């Protein structure tokens, strides 16, 4: 079969304040030839770029708002898509799906994330 898989993991239940970071494996289709396509979707809200990065694999695009706060990078020797989450936030439940053009129409399908609310550690 000549069809590429895309892999995408990191989005679960994870708790509020600190630091996630996501990844997304490559199957049949070079990491270090094209950029990944980030984006969320909230339930029942409208969806929203979260990140763009382009093929030539220069420099990432972000919003000055969101800047700071999400980045995309990928490995060649690895072959796989990083994802770093800073400044997490209340609002950030929602699904992270990838998507990629290369040659053909190749999409995944989209990772649902969970930010609960404030709360005291386990001890």
């Known amino acids: 079969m000549a069809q590429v898989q895309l892999v995408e993991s990191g989005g679960a239940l994870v708790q509020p304040g600190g630091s996630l970071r996501l990844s997304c494996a490559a199957s049949?289709?070079?990491?270090?030839?094209?950029?990944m396509r980030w984006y969320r979707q909230a339930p029942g809200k409208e969806r929203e770029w979260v990140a763009g990065?382009?093929?030539?694999?220069?420099?990432?695009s972000y919003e000055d708002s969101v800047k700071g706060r999400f980045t995309i990078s990928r490995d060649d020797a690895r072959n796989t898509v990083y994802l770093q989450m800073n400044s997490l936030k209340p609002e950030d439940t929602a699904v992270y799906y990838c998507?990629?053009?290369?040659?053909?129409?190749?999409w995944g399908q989209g990772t649902q994330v969970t930010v609960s609310s404030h709360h005291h550690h386990h001890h």
């Open positions: 998507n990629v053009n290369v040659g053909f129409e190749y």
């Open positions: 049949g289709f070079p990491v270090n030839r094209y950029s």
């Open positions: 990065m382009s093929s030539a694999g220069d420099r990432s």
